[PDB]
Structures are given as structure tokens and as C-alpha cells.
Amino acid sequence: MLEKVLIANRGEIALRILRACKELGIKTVAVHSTADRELMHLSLADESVCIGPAPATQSYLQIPAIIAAAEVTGATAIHPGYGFLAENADFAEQIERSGFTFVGPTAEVIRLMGDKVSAKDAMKRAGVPTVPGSDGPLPEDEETALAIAREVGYPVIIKAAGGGGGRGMRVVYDESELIKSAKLTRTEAGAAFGNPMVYLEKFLTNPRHVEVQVLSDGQGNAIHLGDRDCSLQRRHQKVIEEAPAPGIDEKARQEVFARCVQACIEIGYRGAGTFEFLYENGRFYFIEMNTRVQVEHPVSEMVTGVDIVKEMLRIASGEKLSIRQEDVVIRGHALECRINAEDPKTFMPSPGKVKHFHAPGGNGVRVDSHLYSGYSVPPNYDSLVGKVITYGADRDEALARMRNALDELIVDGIKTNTELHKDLVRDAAFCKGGVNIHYLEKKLGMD
Numbered sequence: 001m002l003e004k005v006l007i008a009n010r011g012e013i014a015l016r017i018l019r020a021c022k023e024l025g026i027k028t029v030a031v032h033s034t035a036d037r038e039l040m041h042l043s044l045a046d047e048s049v050c051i052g053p054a055p056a057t058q059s060y061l062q063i064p065a066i067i068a069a070a071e072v073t074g075a076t077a078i079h080p081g082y083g084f085l086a087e088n089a090d091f092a093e094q095i096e097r098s099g100f101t102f103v104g105p106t107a108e109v110i111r112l113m114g115d116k117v118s119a120k121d122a123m124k125r126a127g128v129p130t131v132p133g134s135d136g137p138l139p140e141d142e143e144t145a146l147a148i149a150r151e152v153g154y155p156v157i158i159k160a161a162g163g164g165g166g167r168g169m170r171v172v173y174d175e176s177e178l179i180k181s182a183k184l185t186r187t188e189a190g191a192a193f194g195n196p197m198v199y200l201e202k203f204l205t206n207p208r209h210v211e212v213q214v215l216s217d218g219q220g221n222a223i224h225l226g227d228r229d230c231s232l233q234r235r236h237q238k239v240i241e242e243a244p245a246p247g248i249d250e251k252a253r254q255e256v257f258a259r260c261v262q263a264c265i266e267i268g269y270r271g272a273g274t275f276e277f278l279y280e281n282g283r284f285y286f287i288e289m290n291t292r293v294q295v296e297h298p299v300s301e302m303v304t305g306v307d308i309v310k311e312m313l314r315i316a317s318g319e320k321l322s323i324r325q326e327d328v329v330i331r332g333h334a335l336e337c338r339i340n341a342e343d344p345k346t347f348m349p350s351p352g353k354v355k356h357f358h359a360p361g362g363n364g365v366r367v368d369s370h371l372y373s374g375y376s377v378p379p380n381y382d383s384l385v386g387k388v389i390t391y392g393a394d395r396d397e398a399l400a401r402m403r404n405a406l407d408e409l410i411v412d413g414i415k416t417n418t419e420l421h422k423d424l425v426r427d428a429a430f431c432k433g434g435v436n437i438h439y440l441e442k443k444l445g446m447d
């Protein structure tokens with residue numbers, strides 16, 4: 001087992017990772033900005049190192065600072081969490097060059113899947129179905145671009161190859177705007193991601209965001225932990241997730257599970273990963289693979305009883321996967337609400353002192369949050385303050401418990417999106433289930 005892990009992150013995921021280390025008997029090192037000195041997990045950590053000022057670019061994204069924290073503290077491994085340097089291949093390659101273990105896939109695998117054009121192509125070779133589009137990038141050549149779009153069929157979507165966080169995409173409804181829309185997206189992709197390449201996909205009008213959770217040990221073994229539906233989105237940013245995805249063709253799903261697990265073994269995947277799919281009319285279409293732990297890993301943990309982060313850390317310490325697919329039984333249904341410190345109506349982030357925090361509880365209620373009473377949320381980072389996660393015998397039961405949980409949650413002192421969640425879990429279409437990726441904004445929408 002890994003001697004000592006440095007947690008190269010903050011907030012709730014940092015606390016999540018610390019919990020898993022402690023269960024495994026692993027020594028923890030926390031890194032933090034000057035603005036995050038109040039973070040809950042710092043006091044629970046064995047060692048703590050301030051690695052820069054408030055701005056993320058000068059702290060958490062500062063690779064040299066994180067590597068020096070490991071060297072002084074004698075960390076043997078580094079967990080990147082999600083975001084920041086989790087899918088930064090230079091980070092991975094740098095830490096391994098310095099003789100540390102990375103709790104994630106190989107740097108090359110991060111690059112293979114991080115470039116969304118080569119990822120799609122790797123999935124085609126693995127016989128995993130893909131969203132119809134350009135076979136590779138969309139060329140600047142006007143004649144060729146226009147012919148490709150025509151063959152796919154409008155509407156299409158232009159997507160950044162190096163894209164992330166739902167940014168660098170543009171939808172084109174008729175051919176007269178394709179070239180100028182592509183021109184604009186490449187420019188915007190150039191600044192935001194340092195790669196101006198874009199590709200073309202069919203714009204799917206009624207899909208659901210369904211994704212497959214995998215774990216792979218890098219020694220020939222891989223399993224899935226079912227799927228998740230994450231269709232409720234605002235600006236391509238997920239708000240609620242659930243597992244398993246309800247109302248899915250069982251044959252289609254069972255087929256996609258096999259393909260994904262088989263791909264892990266092909267490409268040599270090591271750690272936790274997620275294949276992201278768009279599901280439409282009984283059929284899956286790959287869009288991307290997240291080569292890290294996900295925000296919404298808990299719903300999958302609820303329905304399988306497999307601890308994804310502990311497995312990650314076991315794999316990283318060099319262990320074979322213990323769990324066989326035989327033993328992975330998806331049971332019940334789980335629901336996650338992302339609790340964000342933002343305005344529930346204007347979505348403007350809401351930093352501040354949490355004068356009083358009270359967490360919901362009871363049967364089938366889990367809470368993952370670094371909040372505590374007296375804690376000040378800083379302005380410098382993402383708006384995620386906690387995740388309320390319910391579990392039941394069925395989807396209706398998970399929904400009933402989220403209502404209850406949401407009723408008891410108090411984050412007094414700042415604004416949250418809690419009232420939005422309260423509406424969503426009473427929304428007729430969502431309570432029915434299987435709403436598409438366009439539903440929330442459409443709903444919001446009517447205003």
C-alpha cells in the first residue's frame with residue numbers, strides 16, 4: 001500500500017480523497033492556496049503545505065510548487081482529483097520523471113483521450129460506436145468543410161479537439177454559416193485551450209448524457225460499475241446526476257459495457273475512467289472519455305457498493321483489481337444534487353461566510369462537502385460547495401429522499417442553487433425520467 005499521498009486539489013474532492021486514504025492507512029499531504037487556509041481537510045491531514053497565493057494559476061495549477069511539496073514531505077504518490085492538473089499530461093509525466101506515483105492513467109493515455117479527435121478515432125478501432133461527424137478534424141478548406149457537413153447532415157456542431165468544461169462548441173443550423181462559425185470556434189479554441197483544431201459532429205436534438213464508469217488495473221483487468229445519467233445541464237455543465245440511467249435498452253447498454261471494458265484492456269487504461277456517451281433512440285454514441293475520477297462518482301458507488309477512490313489508490317499502489325464483474329451488482333437507484341454557492345436565478349457565484357451549515361441525514365442520504373459553520377467560501381475557485389446524494393430501492397424512492405434531504409439542508413450566509421434542486425425533484429418531466437440534455441435550459445426557459 002502507498003506510503004503517503006499528496007492531494008493536489010481542494011474543496012470537497014480533496015476531503016473525499018483524504019477519507020479514502022485514511023481508510024486505507026495512507027499518510028496524507030494537503031496542498032493549499034493562501035485563500036484556502038480554512039479548508040476542512042487541512043485539519044484532518046497529516047501534513048499541509050501552502051503552495052501559492054489565491055489565484056489558481058499561481059497555486060493549484062503551479063506544477064513546480066506541487067512537485068516541491070511532494071519532495072519536502074516525502075510523498076510517494078499524488079492524487080490529482082478532478083480538474084486542475086488531473087488531465088494535464090505534462091503534470092503526470094513530470095511527477096513520474098521525479099519518481100512519484102500518479103494516481104491515474106499513463107501520461108500518453110491522458111494525451112490520447114485528452115485530444116478529442118484521436119479519442120474518437122481510438123474508440124472506432126475498439127469497435128465502440130461514435131457520434132457521426134468528420135473523420136478527424138474539420139479542415140479550413142471551404143470546399144472540403146462544406147462537403148463534410150453536407151454528408152453528416154445539418155444541424156451540426158463544431159467542437160474543439162482540446163475542449164473541456166463544456167466550452168469551445170458552436171451549433172450550425174444551415175450551411176451559410178458553417179465556415180464563419182468554424183473560423184470563430186478555432187480562434188476561441190486557440191486561446192482557451194492552446195489548440196485551434198475543431199471537429200464536426202451531428203448535433204443530436206434528443207439525446208441523454210449517459211456514461212460508463214470503469215476501473216482498470218493496468219495489469220490486464222478492467223470492470224464497469226454501471227452507468228450514470230447526467231442530462232440535466234446548464235451551459236453543458238452538469239447539475240444533477242443519477243445511477244443507473246433509467247429506461248435504457250438493456251441490450252444496447254450491456255453491449256456498450258463490454259465494448260468499454262474491452263477498450264480499457266486494449267489501450268492500457270490504469271485507474272478510474274468514464275466513457276461519455278450520447279444516447280438517442282436506443283443507441284449509444286461516444287463523445288469523450290474522462291481520464292480521472294468524476295464529480296459524480298458517488299451515485300455509482302451507491303448502486304454498486306464499490307469505493308472508486310479506494311480502488312484508484314489500490315491500483316496505483318500496484319494491486320490487481322480484486323473485484324470481478326460477477327460480483328458487481330447494480331442495485332437500487334441513486335441521485336446526486338450539486339450544491340453550488342451561486343445565485344439560484346442569475347448563477348453568479350456567491351462567496352461568503354457560512355454562518356450556519358446543517359447537513360441532511362437519515363436512511364439513504366449521503367453528503368460529500370467540506371462546508372462547516374464559520375467557514376468562508378473564497379471567490380477564486382469553482383462554485384461547488386457540496387454534493388447531496390440519495391439512494392433508494394428505486395428511482396421514486398431516491399427522489400423522495402432528495403426532497404427530504406433538500407428540506408433539511410441549511411447553508412446560511414450565502415446563496416445556493418438549493419431551491420432550483422427542490423423544483424427539479426418535483427418537476428413532472430424529470431420525476432417521469434429520461435429527459436434530454438436540452439431540457440433544463442428549455443425549462444428555465446419558460447420565464
Ligand SMILES: Nc1ncnc2c1ncn2[C@@H]1O[C@H](COP(=O)(O)CP(=O)(O)O)[C@@H](O)[C@H]1O
Nearest residue numbers: 163164165166167201202203204209236287437
Ligand atoms: N453532438 C452533440 N450534439 C448535441 N449536444 C452535444 C454534442 N456533443 C456534446 N454535446 C453537449 O455538450 C456536453 C459535453 O460534451 P463533451 O463532448 O463532453 C464537451 P466537454 O469536453 O467540454 O465536456 C454534452 O453533455 C452535450 O450536452
Ligand SMILES: [Mg+2]
Nearest residue numbers: 165166276288
Ligand atoms: Mg465532457
